Amino acid sequence: MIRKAFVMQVNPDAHEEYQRRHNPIWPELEAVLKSHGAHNYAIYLDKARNLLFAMVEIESEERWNAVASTDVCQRWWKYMTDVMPANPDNSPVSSELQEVFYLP
Amino acid sequence: MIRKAFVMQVNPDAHEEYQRRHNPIWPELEAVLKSHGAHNYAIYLDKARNLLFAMVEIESEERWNAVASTDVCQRWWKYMTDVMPANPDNSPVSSELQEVFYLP
Ligand SMILES: C[C@H](O)[C@H](O)[C@@H](O)[C@@H](O)C=O
């Protein structure tokens, strides 16, 4: 599939709360993520830098992009603004990373 | 397997060279990485921050740790000191990330 990686940020005082909110995430959000073709979605926390390293395999660029249009992702992102920096539309501040090495 | 993620840094002026050196990496280093149980070793570059987010699945913590004792990893790391921050023993400056979310 298409390997995608990106990085987001997290509030310095919300490391524990951010993690707790993903164990588990809302069942309706999980359903939507899976329906939209995501696989092996993993997020890692860089405690010293308040950074979140995410990796996810998706079947479709467009479908993955469509998650932002769903109500559940929208309310999820609104909900998450209290623990991490977000863009005006409530999507988390994020940057796409460039794959430089891959060894199966 | 055991999912491991860590972050390293890269010199601001060596983004292109760092990537070129991994396509492909030395064949004897690949052989050693695989012999020591590494799977799906991926490294992503954060251009804005000069950061390298890496993720690798390994069969054994001890075997993975043993890679640093091999001559090839040692000469590889000595070689890489010219493009990225390194510890006195030449291993790259690195920090273990904490997995906070995982959706198969
Ligand atoms: C499930 C995942 O969290 C979501 O896909 C991301 O956009 C971000 O909100 C995570 O905190």
Ligand SMILES: C[C@H](O)[C@H](O)[C@@H](O)[C@@H](O)C=O
């Ligand atoms: C193959 C890989 O590069 C190695 O495992 C890391 O320690 C670092 O040197 C990479 O640049």
